Every structure is written in C-alpha cells, then in structure tokens.
Symmetry: C3
Subunit: 333 residues, 3 copies
C-alpha cells in the first residue's frame, strides 16, 4: 500500500499496521515458494548491493530473493568499486540511482544510508548499519509468530541478554515499540541502550500493550520468557580491543542451560541472529575460548545452540522471505 | 554493420561513420529503455568481466546493460581468480574465449588488452586501460550531443583542463580526430600528451573541421568553450608519490568559478568522468585538502560540481547506454 | 538415475557405470550447446559457490554451465562472507541449505566438504579440495575419449609425471580404479601417493583391466603412453618454502620434448589441468625461472605446451560441459 518507493532504513518509520502487512506478505511469499506457486513480480528490475561489512545471510538473502522474483543483482563488495572511498556517498548514490531500481546498503552508521537514501531517488534498504538492523527483526518477528501461533505479539515475552547497545539492541526497542512485545533487555548498565530511544520506544510499546524492562538481574529478567535472544559481544566494525572488556562485562549474561532454566517456561525457544561463537571450532572462537576461558560457548553455550529450543536456523531461513517481501513491497505496483 | 565481432580497444580503430552509427544506436537503446519498448538482443550470451583496477560506473554499466539485453555476467575482480597473476594473459584469454561470448578488461596498459584480444577469439572491450578509455568518450560524446542539439561536433568547442597525459587526455585526442571537435587541452607542458599522437590526431581532426590546441594559458584556452572537462590529477595505478608534484603543477588548472567565467559562454557546461575529489568529505580527499590546502575542491571546486553547469550525472548515466550499444553491436546479428 | 540429490565429493563414491553415464550426459550436453538445441533443465534453481582458493576455470565453468541451464549463482569468494572463518562450516552449511538448491566448495581438505555435505541437505560438489579434484578428471576422461575414439579406457595408457601426491595424483588413482586405464605415475618416491589408496585403487583398476604402475624411471614409465599429463610442482595452499625442495626433486620429471620422445608414440598428446608455469612470462614464473634456472618451462616446457600434442585447451573447455552434466544430474528429475 504506502510501501511503493518507500525506503526501509529503521523500523520506527513504519506504522504497526505497515509492519504487520509486511509480515503478512512475507508469510505469503514463503508459502508461495514452498507450494511452487510463486508469481515473480520484480522481473527486469536491477538492484545494486553495496556491502561494506561482511555477510553470509543478508547477502545471500538479497540475492536469492531477487533471483526468485526475476530481478538481477550487482554485488559491490568491500573494496572493489570506487565506493570504498575515493568518492562521496552522495555522488555514489546519484550515480547508482541512474542505473538501478533499488539499492541495498550494509555498513557503518546510519548517516551513510540516510544520505544514500536522500540522493539516490530509488528505494534504499538497510542491510545493517551500526545502529539499526531492521531487516533482521522482520525475520525474527515472523519466526516468533510461526512458533507461537494464535498469539498476538503483545502476548509474548522476549528477553534479550548480552550487549544491549549494539545495533541489535537498538532494533529490539523499535520492534517492541511497534508490537507491544514485553521486551526485556537483560544487560549490565554499561551496555544499556541510549535512554532517549528507550523512553520513546517504551512509550510506544505501552500504547500497544507492551513494556520495555531493562535490568542487570538475570533471574528476574528471564522469568516467564517465551524467547531468549542474544548476539556476539563485539559487533562487526568495533575495535578488537573491546573484546577484553566486553567479555569482562557480559560473561554472566551468557545464554547457558541454567539461564534457560531460570525462565521457568519449558517451551522457551532460543534465538540468535548469527554468526554465533558457540563452539571451540572457529578461528577467533578458539583463541577467545582458551585465553579468557569461555569453554564451550561465549554468548551462547553450544549445548543451548544445538538444543531443541534453538530455532536459529528457522530464523535464519526467514531472513530471505522477509527481504523478498520488502523488495516486492517497495518495487511493485 | 562492420561491428559484429569487432573489438573496442581504442577509438581510432573506427571510422567517423562507425563512431556515429554507434552513437546513434546508443541513443536508440536509451530511448527504448525509457519507453519500455526495449527489445533484448543478447539473450543467452555469457560475458566475462576482468577488473584489475576499481570501478563503480564502468562495472555497473556493464552489468545492467547486459542484464537488460538478457545476457549474464561473471565478475572476475582484482584478485579472486588466477588472472591476478600466476597465469599468462595469453593463457587466460584462450581459456575464457572457450567459455564466454565477450570479455571486458579494465587494467594497466594497452599491451594487456591487445594481447587479450589477439588470443581470445571473442570481442574484447576496453573498460579502461592506462593509455585509453574509449568507452568513456562514447558516453561523453553523446552527453555533449544531448545538451547542444542541432550542433554537429565540429561546431562545438571542448576544453580539457588538468593532466593532459593520462588515459583521458589521450582519449580526447582520439575523439577529436574522429569528430572535428575544437579540442583544447589546457595543461602545463609537463603534462602534455605525447607529440606523436597529437600530430596524428590533429591532422585527422582538421580534416573533419576541428583543431587540437595545446596551451598552458588558461585564459586563452577556455575562451568560447561549450564544455569544460577535467579529471583527477593522479590516476588509478600511479604511485602515491605523484600527488605532491601533480598538485604543484596542476592547481592553477583547477576548474573553479573564475575558470568557468573566463569562458565567456554563460551556457557552458561542466563535465567530469568521475570519481571527482570535489569536497572535503572523502578519505584521501580531506587528507589532501588540509595538507596542500585545496579547500573545497581539487580538480574541481565543489561549487562548480554542484553548479547548474554540472551535467556530470547525466554524463554518468550515459555510460551504460553507450556500453549497451557497444555490446549489442559487437555480439548481435 | 541414482544421481538425483547425490553429492560429488570424490570419484570412488561412484560405480564405473555411473561415471560412464555421467560422461555420456556431458557429451550430450556439449553437443546440444554447439547445435543450439540445448534444453535448459535447471531453471529457477539457485546455487551457492563457496571458493576458498583461487580459480579461473572451475569458477567460470560453474557459472556459465548454470547460466546455460537457467540457474543463478552466488559467488562467496575467499573472504567476503562469514564463511572465511568466524562461523562453523557446520553452521554455514545449515544456513546455505535453507536458501540454495546446490552448493559448490573449493577449499582445503576433504573433511570440510564432507562436513559441508552432511549438514547442508542439498547436493554438494567438490570444486577441488586438498586431496581430491573429481570434477577435473571427468573433464579429462572425456577429453581423452574425444581424442582416441573407438577406444575403451582400458585400451589407453596414461602417464602422469610430477608430484604424484597432490590432489591430482590422488584423483588419477580413482579414475583408473573406475576405468581400467593403464595408469603410470612417474614420480620420485618421495612424492608417491599414499600406499593405502594405491592398493585399493590398483585392485579395482585390475578388475576393470588396468594397472597402476608407480616408478621413478622416466624412460620405462612414459613408454607407449597415449597421454602424458603433469601439474605444477607446488599446489595451491602449500607453503612457499616447498618450492625449493620440490624443484630439487621433480625437475628431472619435467615434461619436455625428449620426454615426449621416449614415449615412442608420435600420436601422444599432452594434458595439463592448468595453470601451468610453462614460460618466463609470469609473476612467480620468471622469479622461479631465473633463480633455479628453469628457463622455458617448469613442469612443462613451453615448446611442448604450444606443441601440436598439447590439447590442454580442449581439456580446459571440457571442464564446463562436465560440470554442467554433474549439475543437471544431481538437481534434475
Ligand atoms: N551486532 C551484530 C549483528 C549481526 C547481524 N547478522 C546478520 O545480519 C547475519 P549475516 O552477517 O550473515 O548477514 C554485528 O554487527 O556483528
Ligand atoms: N584518469 C582516471 C579516469 C577514471 C575513469 N572513470 C571511470 O571509468 C568511472 P568508474 O571508475 O566508476 O568506472 C583514472 O584512471 O583514475
Ligand atoms: N594441484 C593443483 C591443481 C589445480 C587444478 N586446476 C583447476 O582446477 C583449474 P582452475 O584453478 O582455473 O579452477 C593445485 O591445487 O594447484
């Protein structure tokens, strides 16, 4: 409806109704692809994909969703083009807008994608920025909805442990402000999200029947949750130095078994946007695990990651249907 | 006509008539895409795109132009494949020719793309080499033609300030030799193009009614110009060290407002192939701007870049129609 | 037949009949594309292509073969995505399987691609691993078959000089075990393939009428060969240090003219999977050539590489038909 040629930069630029419509379209599109009745809508549209940070899911998601819908893609990865920086984003935008029908941007800081959106004159979607990550939450919302049918979002309790001031924390706030989820940010105070945003989002959440609780206590936070959610303690783009202090702060907020048990709900499902350092298998996974001693998981224990509660791969699948939905909504009819 | 299976390496391998035909086809194709009546011609053709230097426009241009025409693309960026060097270009060519229908090459030095063309046995297009950049000029010629209708090229005066011995300077010469433009290369003598090429191109320009003037004087050069054109003072692939001496030489050749005023034509339009360091916004843009003191523009002032005279983004758009034209001309019927 | 949803990790996971069927399909598909009667089978299938080592042929091959068959491709090159390592291959697999219909993997070590195949739940093809390279041999087998018509594989003598314990040596063994080729691995003992595999493959080769001979003597090895085959002395992923000892060992195993002459067959054709350091033209080609003194070729003399015996470019072309065949076999009907 009021989606055609709209950008998708952060969730609060949308009404509850818009978000819900979107979520509904995504769900249709998912269902259409499994039934094989997918009607391509974006045929002959060309989309540029600017990536300044790495990505497996978000990139792949944009690519297959476009290919299904009959669109083609151009991946301008981190350093390959002039956009790396040797040219204004303002110029880049004005260039790409003359050739493409839509642009994705993954990067550093909302200023960039906003500037990219003013000047491009085509829909700009936020693939993840330093502050927000709207596309993720769409997928998470739907995944939450698919695992608790017949429940409105205001009937669900979502807990987010970990670093609450990263792009994911910020995005949670927006989600709740639009859905009335009972958000619970279990984090040390040092990692709490900026208060101006909490206030705005809290006010809006309560209007819709939710409430944003922030608390350093794990035990009163996780209680009664339908979902536990967490993320890496240092995000993409933050300095390597942060690891030593972030582990120091956040390790009592690890989503472990005891953690899942303090919930009290045996039906509680775990969520994680991924990548997740859950085992002593990776490159910096093993290095961090021996050094500080996070044996068997950092933000989440490997036992919980491979638990029946873990629905992260469903969540992960839902990234692409969600993005397909955003794209057919902003580019068609 | 005598285009099918021809390479596009430098402009002087074409007749004035050929160039003009090409320009005409481009114009048709542009018009067809805006009207939505674009008939795809390159369906089922596969094209490799070798890039050894960066690119936003040229790469994107090749990609969307192919996608529109129903062709697919394979981007072999700077280091990813064996072509980086671990294998002869001679071998690379012979390999790729067995799989693709056409090959683009962006790189260092004409020898490379020529060798690539002898051995590939499919059309090879020059995406930019150290010496030439033919594809650009096609677009610029058309953009010039679209802003001064009812004017033959011999009725137009084009000034090129800046480093006249880069790939762009060299390309100007070819353009004039084929169009009878009144070329004016306003540059310090130290940056003048190689005399052998000037002579050959001058002779040819004059035959077609033009003349290539070289001069260190800004004032007598810019006078009566229909277009001012410029480019970065150090090109891709040149050593970082060159910046200090090139700024030293070329800063009086900055295209600024006074510069545009000495023209005497109030209808004069500015052109720049881009990227352009016109503001104190970029990475090395700001570093260069404080150090040497180019506040508010290096080759071109930001005031002129955002001037109503600036038609650089039209120019930029015209890169892809032009390339689409080259490709349908060399690959179809 | 028993190909749909099968992985293609190493050749010995297939019967002689399966290999031969495959080879036959490839041959059809080749023929169909030249006649222009190619019926696309993989329309609307999306394929991820994980590359951790470089590639020109294998990547290009996967791309055009997919494009011909109406499929689209996503290239996740060496470091761009999270797969580089920051995430388990086990997780990566489970993610990609939810989005794609098939996955290619080029990398380091068979464990990786096997783990990738257990967890992905879609066909996984081995683009080259440290130990095997099955896709190559398919192409080589067909190329061998196209140059000696009316000859069953058991009627052919294939010699492989050089480093017999790389991924290519190992693959030869598998090929013979399935075809009854008279394999001859002419190599120093220090470079002989692991005996457990030789034994298994020898037993199988003999059943089918072949025999795997290993020998340090060049002269008795090359005698009566229909094909001489060789490869670079240090493979992708091995330490740069190995060059000095590998040249020391292997230079008497260079495929030179005298080498081709000791064969005794004047119809003997040369094969090489490529890249080949055959001239003093490359980056590390020239550096190695002056230092150790391999003037005019390392594994193979440039004279032999450009000889009429050289059919390496036919071989190279046959990489993509072969891969197209693997893909339509594992993804269709
Ligand atoms: N705060 C985290 C969020 C990662 C989001 N993950 C994704 O979007 C999945 P992807 O990396 O595969 O696209 C960070 O910035 O590191
Ligand atoms: N002499 C300049 C020319 C740049 C040409 N620009 C383009 O082709 C536009 P692009 O870089 O976006 O493809 C140089 O070599 O740096
Ligand atoms: N043992 C060699 C094998 C190279 C195989 N070559 C290919 O697959 C051709 P490509 O590199 O163009 O894909 C090595 O590992 O270096």
């Amino acid at each position: 409806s009021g989606f055609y040629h709209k950008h998708f930069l952060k969730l609060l630029d949308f009404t509850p109704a818009e978000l819900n419509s979107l979520l509904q379209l995504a769900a249709k599109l998912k269902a259409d692809k499994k039934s094989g009745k997918e009607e391509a809508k974006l045929t002959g549209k060309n989309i540029a994909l600017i990536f300044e940070k790495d990505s497996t899911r978000t990139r792949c998601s944009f690519e297959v969703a476009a290919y299904d819908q009959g669109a083609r893609v151009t991946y301008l990865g981190p350093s390959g083009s002039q956009i790396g920086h040797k040219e204004s984003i303002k110029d880049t935008a004005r260039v790409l807008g003359r050739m493409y029908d839509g642009i994705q941007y993954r990067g550093y800081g909302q200023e960039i994608v906003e500037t990219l959106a003013e000047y491009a004159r085509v829909p700009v979607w936020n693939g993840l920025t330093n502050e927000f990550h709207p596309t993720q939450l769409l997928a998470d919302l739907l995944t939450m909805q698919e695992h608790l049918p017949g429940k409105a979002f205001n009937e669900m309790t979502l807990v987010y442990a970990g670093d609450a001031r990263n792009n994911m924390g910020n995005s949670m706030l927006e989600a709740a402000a639009l859905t009335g989820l009972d958000l619970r940010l279990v984090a040390p105070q040092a990692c709490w999200p900026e208060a101006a945003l909490v206030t705005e989002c809290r006010a809006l959440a309560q209007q819709n029947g939710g409430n944003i609780t922030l608390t350093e206590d794990v035990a009163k936070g996780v209680e009664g949750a339908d979902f536990i959610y967490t993320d890496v303690w240092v995000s993409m783009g933050e300095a390597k130095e942060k690891w030593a202090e972030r582990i120091a702060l956040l390790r009592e907020y690890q989503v472990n078994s005891k953690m899942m048990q303090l919930t009290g709900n045996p039906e509680v499902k775990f969520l994680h946007c991924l990548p997740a350092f859950h085992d002593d298998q990776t490159t910096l996974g093993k290095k961090m695990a021996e050094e500080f001693g996070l044996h068997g998981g950092m933000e989440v224990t490997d036992e919980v990651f491979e638990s029946a509660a873990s629905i992260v791969f469903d969540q992960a699948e839902n990234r692409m249907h969600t993005i397909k939905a955003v794209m057919v909504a902003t580019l068609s009819k």
